[PDB]
Amino acid sequence: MHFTIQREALLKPLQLVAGVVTLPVLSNVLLVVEGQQLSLTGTDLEVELVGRVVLEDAAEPGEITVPARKLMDICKSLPNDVLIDIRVEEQKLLVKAGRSRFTLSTLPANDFPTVEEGPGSLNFSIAQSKLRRLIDRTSFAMAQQDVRYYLNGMLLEVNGGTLRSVATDGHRLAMCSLDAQIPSQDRHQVIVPRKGILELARLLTEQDGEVGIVLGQHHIRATTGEFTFTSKLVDGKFPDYERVLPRGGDKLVVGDRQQLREAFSRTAILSNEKYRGIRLQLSNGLLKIQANNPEQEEAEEEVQVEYNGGNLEIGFNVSYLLDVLGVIGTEQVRFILSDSNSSALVHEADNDDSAYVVMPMRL
Amino acid sequence: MHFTIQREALLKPLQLVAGVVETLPVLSNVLLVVEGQQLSLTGTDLEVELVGRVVLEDAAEPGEITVPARKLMDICKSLPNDVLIDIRVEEQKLLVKAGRSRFTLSTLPANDFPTVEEGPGSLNFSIAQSKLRRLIDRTSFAMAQQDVRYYLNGMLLEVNGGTLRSVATDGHRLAMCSLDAQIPSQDRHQVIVPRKGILELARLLTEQDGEVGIVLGQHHIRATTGEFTFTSKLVDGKFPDYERVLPRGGDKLVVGDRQQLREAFSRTAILSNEKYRGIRLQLSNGLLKIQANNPEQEEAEEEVQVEYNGGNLEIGFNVSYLLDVLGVIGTEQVRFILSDSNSSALVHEADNDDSAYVVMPMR
């Protein structure tokens, strides 16, 4: 195995694969030269990322794994635009560029873990920005290290022509729905584990770009010109999210998103550091927000909101409210509430595309 | 105690004192004192005391109290820009008001807050802030972190003739900087300022066109500006005879590009032992060969052209130590003075003997 490559050409995909990179082989990147193509692969056994770069000078084929962080750091630290000569010699990777010589230890290609790569049951393409939006609008809702396996990840659902993302930790929910012109078929649902979905969202930087998606029984695949991403899915059945969404809420409240966010963060300072309880007292054209902690400290704040109807005292985790408010993209925010024991449904001002559910706390 | 103050006016000094609060509970409080039309804010960690003063505009009722520093600062930070804040003590509580936001904080009495009694010292002078900071910035890395020899964990500030000098050393390497300061001194004065205090002092010296008033005493060092008075306790002990540490017999003089050497040392550092950080230098006429090996038999090799004429030298150094020096050398070139493999290296700027750096070899 031997090739030459520019520092920049190698660094781009090598930085991509290094973002996914404990068994020792898992900290290596798999390098494969087939013809004039270099493929770089990184995996953490849940997610596999592959980067492809075209080689210009003649290249001798082969394959090998080398420590990813160390190759990337070596490549990063080299002078700009320098040509790098990479060769395998006696279980070692030899790297030459200019007047610098590096020898790296290697593990055999066969040791590197592989993925099933099935055709799947559905595929479509979509604008990277649209897929990224579904994830960014809902990702905070995901549960972290919950015993229920399904909670630690994001549901992606195709139904009719519609792509939908749902995330919930069992206390709060975030859902977003987009018209994707996906051909009508049966409902398709996948649960992409938390780490993989966040990684995927970060990867979708091409604003005018497309992403090819494959849904299977055990994997999702995202493919673009730069990379091919594969994640294992969460085995299990996602809860019926439809039941969680509150319905028939009598009270409707409209408020300035920025004023509510600032008033909630101000009061949050003196709320219980673990439970983050905030008390809301709603009355005609008025929201009182109060916060108390174990040291008997108190923050109070009043905000004028558009609201007409019965008084309502209700408790909510302030962090949850702030998570919602920080993804609402409109100046105003709509809150839909019923009673003290019932959850809140939050929408953008004019749009039902994203919906947020926040269950209350006992006061 | 009762006063009104603009949010911006209160935040500046509050932010300053908050940087020294890290536990006994009163140590995480800020001491607030209203005397006439002045508000003083005091923070301490029992080694360093920082005081901020602000002139109050509206009438103010005097008194004193301590309140949690971080919480007051966060509350002040989160408030609307340019708002007027009303502060008043009521029944062992601080009541903070601004617009429609009410806050009640728990308080501890002023008696509990530690007091530092400030003598006049034996020497005082003023100096440009940026000169004092330079002394510290050029020299701070050399300090020991948690050595058993207490004097090493700090920086020596010495006044001899009209020269202000800073010395730091962990026993493996040394950093010194000397500046003419026209300071009248009948006798030589030494102080050892603890590392937390000296680093904090450096960060506070932010006015490039400003001056700082210094007092040296037997047990304290005091630094005064319009914005603050910083007092630190000193390390009780005699600082080592640093002059003996400096190498005198060097027969080999090397000149090199600072940026090329830095880049070549960081590149080779990647494959050096992660704990011992050993690099090998091979010096011959016009050339420096840098090699790094680790326990996994990985190797980085690099050559740099340098101005040098004389006998061959093989010598080992900790590469972090060399990089620490190179990252504070302000000139495009750097001078290395060496003698033998078992003897220390002396490093200077290109044209100047003002800063001097000593690094002991490995092996």
Choose among A269, A317, A313: nearest CA to A293: A269
Residues of chain B found within 8 Å of residue A303, distances taken between Cβ atoms: 100
B interface test, pick of A99, A267, A271, A288 with most B CB neighbours within 10 Å? A99
Instruction: State the smallest CA–CA distance between residue B28 and chain A in angstroms.
Output: 15
Ramachandran sector of residue B147 (left: φ over 0; alpha: ψ -120 to 50; beta: rest): beta
Q: Tokens at residue A75, please?
A: 């490549």
Helix (H) or strand (E) holding A193: strand A188-193
For residue A360, the number of C-alpha atoms closer than 13 Å in the C-beta half-sphere is 19
Angstrom CA distances, A31 to A48, A232, B11, B297, B349, stand at 14, 22, 54, 21, 44
Q: Are B133 and B202 in contact (CB under 8 A)?
A: yes
3-state class (DSSP) for residue A110: helix
Give the whole-angstrom CA distance, residue B272 versus residue B283: 19
Q: Are A132 and A204 in contact (CB under 8 A)?
A: yes
Q: 10 Å Cβ neighbour count for A243?
A: 7
Contacting A with CB below 8 Å, chain B residues are 71, 74-75, 78-80, 100-106, 263-264, 266-267, 270-271, 296-304
Beta bridge partners of A29: A66
Identify which of A99, A263, A302 has the shortest CB distance to residue B302.
A99
Q: Are A177 and A162 in contact (CB under 8 A)?
A: yes
Contact B103 A299 (CB under 8 A): yes
Instruction: State the smallest CA–CA distance between residue B70 and chain A in angstroms.
Output: 10
For residue A263, give the chain B residue with the closest CA: B101
Give the whole-angstrom CA distance, residue A11 versus residue A206: 18
Helix (H) or strand (E) holding A67: strand A62-67
Q: Answer yes or no: same fold for A1-115 and A116-246.
A: yes
Beta bridge partners of A155: A166, A191
Q: Where are the domains of chain A?
A: 1-115, 116-246, 247-363
3-state class (DSSP) for residue B123: strand
For residue A336, the number of C-alpha atoms closer than 13 Å in the C-beta half-sphere is 15
Contact A262 B71 (CB under 8 A): no
For A293-353, list the strands marked E by DSSP.
Answer: 298-303, 312-317, 332-337, 344-348
φ, ψ at A138 (rounded to 5°): -120, -15
For B22-27, which contacts have Cβ atoms below 8 Å and span 24 or more sequence positions?
B25/B108, B26/B66, B26/B108, B26/B112, B26/B113, B26/B114, B27/B114
Residue with tokens 């937390």: B196
Give the whole-angstrom CA distance, residue A147 versus residue B99: 45
The residue type of A35 is: G
User: Of how many residues is chain A composed?
Assistant: 363
Identify which of B74, B100, B106 has the shortest CB distance to residue A301.
B100
CATH code for A1-115? 3.10.150.10
Contact B75 A297 (CB under 8 A): no
Residues of chain B found within 8 Å of residue A299, distances taken between Cβ atoms: 75, 101-104
Give the whole-angstrom CA distance, residue B38 versus residue B54: 6
Give the whole-angstrom CA distance, residue A127 versus residue A179: 12
A·B CB contacts under 8 A: 83
The residue type of A86 is: I
Domain B248-363 has CATH 3.10.150.10: yes
Q: Tokens at residue A22, please?
A: 């404990």
Helix (H) or strand (E) holding B74: helix B69-78
Q: Tokens at residue A355, please?
A: 């919906």
Q: Tokens at residue A54, please?
A: 């075209």
Contact B298 A105 (CB under 8 A): yes
Fold classification of B1-116 is DNA Polymerase III; Chain A, domain 2 (3.10.150)
Hey, what CATH class is B117-247 in?
Answer: alpha beta
Choose among A363, A204, A176, A208: nearest CA to A280: A363
3-state class (DSSP) for residue B245: helix
Q: Tokens at residue B344, please?
A: 């220390």
φ, ψ at B152 (rounded to 5°): -70, -30
Give the whole-angstrom CA distance, residue B226 versus residue B116: 20
Give the whole-angstrom CA distance, residue A85 versus residue A27: 22
Ramachandran sector of residue B357 (left: φ over 0; alpha: ψ -120 to 50; beta: rest): beta
Choose among A240, A133, A239: nearest CA to A176: A133
Pairing of strands B345-349, B333-338: antiparallel
Q: In what order do the strands lie in the sheet with B101-106?
A: A312-317, A277-283, A286-292, A298-303, B101-106, B93-98, B84-89, B2-6
CATH code for A116-246? 3.10.150.10
First to last CA, chain B: 65
Q: 10 Å Cβ neighbour count for B174?
A: 22
Beta bridge partners of A280: A289, A314
Residue with tokens 């190698």: A10
**How would you class B238 by CB atoms within 10 Å of its CB: exposed for 0-12, middle for 13-18, buried for 19 or more?**
exposed
Label residues A105-132 b or e (16+ Cβ within 10 Å = b).
Answer: bbbebeebeebeeeebeeebebbbbebb
Q: 10 Å Cβ neighbour count for B332?
A: 10
DSSP A259-278: HHHHHHHHHHTTS-TTT-EE
For residue A298, give the chain B residue with the closest CA: B104
Q: 10 Å Cβ neighbour count for B219?
A: 12
Choose among B173, B196, B9, B174: nearest CA to B87: B9
DSSP A341: T
Q: 10 Å Cβ neighbour count for B284?
A: 15
Give just the sign of the alpha carbon dihedral A123, A128, A131, A132.
positive
Instruction: State the smallest CA–CA distance between residue B3 and chain A in angstroms.
Output: 19
User: Of how many residues is chain B composed?
Assistant: 363
Contact B75 A99 (CB under 8 A): no
Identify which of A70, A105, A270 has the shortest CB distance to residue B270.
A70
Resolution, given in Å to one decimal, reads: 2.4
Residues of chain B found within 8 Å of residue A295, distances taken between Cβ atoms: 106
Residue B13's contacts (CB-CB under 8 Å, 6 or more residues apart) are B39, B41, B52, B53, B54, B227, B228
Contact B78 A266 (CB under 8 A): yes
Pairing of strands B287-293, B93-98: unpaired
Label residues B250-268 b or e (16+ Cβ within 10 Å = b).
Answer: bebebebbbebbbbbbbbb
Q: Tokens at residue A245, please?
A: 């969404």
- H helices of B188-337, in order, are 195-204, 242-245, 258-269, 319-326
Pairing of strands B299-305, A92-97: unpaired
Q: Tokens at residue B8, please?
A: 């911006």
Identify which of A101, A297, A301 has the shortest CB distance to residue B105.
A297
Identify which of B106, B263, B300 has the shortest CB distance to residue A295.
B106
Instruction: State the smallest CA–CA distance between residue A79 and chain B in angstroms.
Output: 9
First to last CA, chain A: 68
Fold classification of A247-363 is DNA Polymerase III; Chain A, domain 2 (3.10.150)
Q: Are A64 and A31 in contact (CB under 8 A)?
A: yes
φ, ψ at B131 (rounded to 5°): -80, -45
Contact A105 B296 (CB under 8 A): yes
DSSP A225-250: SSEEEEEE---S----HHHHS--S--
Identify which of B104, B264, B267 has the shortest CB distance to residue A297.
B104
Give the whole-angstrom CA distance, residue A173 versus residue A244: 8
